[PDB]
Each structure stands twice: as structure tokens, then as C-alpha cells.
Amino acid sequence: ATDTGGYAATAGGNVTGAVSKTATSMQDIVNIIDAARLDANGKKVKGGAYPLVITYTGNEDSLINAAAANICGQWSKDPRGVEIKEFTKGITIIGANGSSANFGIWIKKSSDVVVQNMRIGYLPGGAKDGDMIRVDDSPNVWVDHNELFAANHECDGTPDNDTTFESAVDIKGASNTVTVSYNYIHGVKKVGLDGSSSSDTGRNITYHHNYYNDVNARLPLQRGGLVHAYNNLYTNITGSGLNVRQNGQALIENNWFEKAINPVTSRYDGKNFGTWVLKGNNITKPADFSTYSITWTADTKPYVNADSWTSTGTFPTVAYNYSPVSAQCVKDKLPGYAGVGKNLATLTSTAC
């Protein structure tokens, strides 16, 4: 169906007349998408000629393992990624169990795109936009059950001292409805944007059932819009978590936070603070901060931390249907449903 447990409502390429293809390499993916633009007469069709289900069977572990051993040699290399530009017929890129990629998926001005079961890590080209997954001007995109990783570390002398590795899931532009779920994101300094600038405000994004471990910041860095974060496991956040900016609104419910600095905040602009509605998280009052090693820091510009752990605004009625398990169940069970090789399994209260 089209139910993703979030704002995005798409079946991707799993629709009527979908054509299944197997890609054994990054280049196959590129070629497969190109072929999908031609009609029965060999002429290009705007938005694509037919829906696609690409099963990626390639494995780039040698590239990944080599990169892991020389972290600081990645940022200056050429970035690698498959671009899904202006393809609206519907497409799903799903990795076969055991597949791996040292390249990113860049979605631009497309719609109804699903990316699942992909293990992407240590991408080269952090200094030249080497994002793992990018959603730009693309509504109805579902990024589900992937493992996105690198090293939560910044090498010396990188451009802006911020380019050792690019982000895991960046959302910007008119990507009006997006769902980011069941991903195992670890060893990432900048997890992802939700708006590329002060002017790029908006969108309705849902982050659910993601397991974050050893990440520094941007979970996400929100600029306006609505963000619904539920059933996520946030551990070892070394910088800040959800940064709600430009009057954005967030509903933060039934998540488990632990060993996190500034888990919920609004900083870096000095104005137009966003709001949040907190409910059902493992933290319920400031007394719980010590229990779960939650630390807070100030910023040089005016900011707002959720150190009182109280709701600071409201949130409109959630459109879709979802059934969150308890925060405890997340902490107990989530690590077994999030990521690759889980056969796209979901956490239900029955499993709690």
C-alpha cells in the first residue's frame, strides 16, 4: 500500500506495471533508470516511461573497509552517487541482503521514491556534497530500513573543518512529504538537514523507529515546517539532537534518549525559535536527566533548550495513522528491526 507510518504516502515502484530489474553495480542502476525513460518507440517520456523496482545486489565492502582504515583520505576524493532526477513514475531501490554501497543516492525533482535495505558507508567526497541520501524538491519519498554510517570524527584541515564526511539524509527544497524510518544511522557527524537555509522553510517530515548511535548533530536541523519524531532511539549524541529553527513545530513522542548533549534545542540563529510538544519519552521531567546522562550546554547566541522538559508550543492533528510502542519497548527491541537484513521488519506492541 501507500502507508509509510509518516507523511509520505507512496508504494514507490511497487505499483501496477512495475518492471523489476537487477543492478549488480552503481553503473547498472544508472543505466537501468535511463532505459526506463524510453517508450515502445525509443522516445523519451517525461517523468519516466514505466515504474521500476531495482534490486541492488552489488557489494562494495572492499571500498568501505579501505575507507574506514583511512578516514581522512575520503573528503578530497570524487563524490560517487546515482542521481534520480525528474523520475515520477514510481521507483524503489532495494538492496539484496548482503549488498553494500560506497556511493550515495541523490533524488532531485522526483516523487514516489522508496530506498530500502541499503547499507551505505564512508562515502568519498565530503568536500563536494558527497551525501549518502539526498531528497531535494522531491515529495512522497520513503527512506526505510537502511544503515548509513561513517566515523563521527572531523579530520584536521578539511574545508570549513566540516567536510570529512557529508550527511546521511539531507532533505531540502519542495520535498513536502518525507518519511525516514527504521534506519540505523551511526558514526555520522551531520545526520541531515530539513531545509538548506533560513529561507528553505517548510515540509512535513516523519522520523520514526530510527536507531541513532554516535552522531554529533542535526537529527534533524529543522527549518520551519512540521516534524514528527516518534519511537526513535537516540544514544550517544555528542553535539545536539533535534534543532527546531525558523518557527518550525515538532511533536517528539515515545522516543528513548540516553547519553545525549542538547537532545532537543533551538540554537544558532539567535531568534525565531521553534516549538516542541513532548510526550511519552523516557524523559518526563528534568529529574530524569541524570538518570539518562542528558547534558545541556549554552550557545553564544540566544537559544532555547528543553531543559525544563516542557512543551513550548502546539502541533496540528497528525494526518496519518501510526501506533507507537512504549519508549521502553523501543530501547529494548528497536536495535533488531532497524537497519538492513531485518527483512523490513516493523516493531509492533505485540512484539513488546
UniProtKB/Swiss-Prot annotation:
Pathway(s) served: Glycan metabolism; pectin degradation; 2-dehydro-3-deoxy-D-gluconate from pectin: step 2/5
Principal cellular location given in the protein's record: secreted
Record EC number: 4.2.2.2
Gene Ontology CC annotation, any one: extracellular region
Positions that bind Ca(2+): D129, D131, E166, D170
Disulfide bonds: C72-C155, C329-C352
Pfam families with a match to the protein in the record: Pectate_lyase_4
Cofactor needs: Ca(2+)
Cofactor binding description: Binds 1 Ca(2+) ion per subunit.
Reaction it catalyzes: Eliminative cleavage of (1->4)-alpha-D-galacturonan to give oligosaccharides with 4-deoxy-alpha-D-galact-4-enuronosyl groups at their non-reducing ends
MF GO annotations: metal ion binding; pectate lyase activity
Active site per the UniProt annotation: R218
Record bears the keyword Calcium: yes
Compartments it resides in: Secreted
GO biological process: pectin catabolic process
SUPFAM superfamilies named in the record: Pectin lyase-like (SSF51126)
InterPro entries documented for this protein: Pec_lyase (IPR002022), Pectin_lyas_fold (IPR012334), Pectin_lyase_fold/virulence (IPR011050), PEL (IPR045032)
Record keywords, A-Z: Calcium, Disulfide bond, Lyase, Metal-binding, Secreted, Signal, Virulence
Family: Belongs to the polysaccharide lyase 1 family. PLADES subfamily.
Purpose of the protein: Involved in maceration and soft-rotting of plant tissue.
Protein name as it appears in the record: Pectate lyase C
